[PDB]
Structure 1
């Protein structure tokens, strides 16, 4: 299924995922395609921060949903 990940710079990335995928997996797909390290990624859907060990189905994320990506950098 296609999902959209909207970043804070107005770029939206499309990913192909399955509801059975874990949040950790999603973060790895985002690293693979845009280069952002998983440790800097904070994923938000329906006002909940997504946790690594849960699956997309846990959160009831359906096709064509949009997740928000906030970056948390280490150092500033």
Structure 2
């Protein structure tokens, strides 16, 4: 699917996925390309957090959607 994932530096990376994919799968796809471990990944859509055992279709996440990636920053 043609969808967008927006990062905190204002960068968006695009992935091709299927709705039957798990939240676990998205995190794995993002990891391969940016190197962040899934246990470090937090995914947000329509102000809701996506849960690991769910599929994209469960949240009705469709083509041309924009996703948010949250980072947990130290200080």
TM surpasses 0.5: yes
Larger strand percent = 1
1:34-55 superposed Cα distances (whole Å, 9 cap, x missing partner): 1111111110001111000000
Following TM superposition, by how much is the alpha carbon of 1:73 offset from its aligned partner in structure 2, in angstroms?
5.3
Q: Unpaired runs of 5+ in structure 2?
A: none
How many residues align structurally? 75
Following TM superposition, by how much is the alpha carbon of 1:31 offset from its aligned partner in structure 2, in angstroms?
0.1
Structure 1: 4+ residue segments shifted above 4 A: none
TM-score of the aligned structures, taking structure 2 as reference length = 0.93
Q: Unpaired runs of 5+ in structure 1?
A: none
TM-score of the aligned structures, taking structure 1 as reference length = 0.91
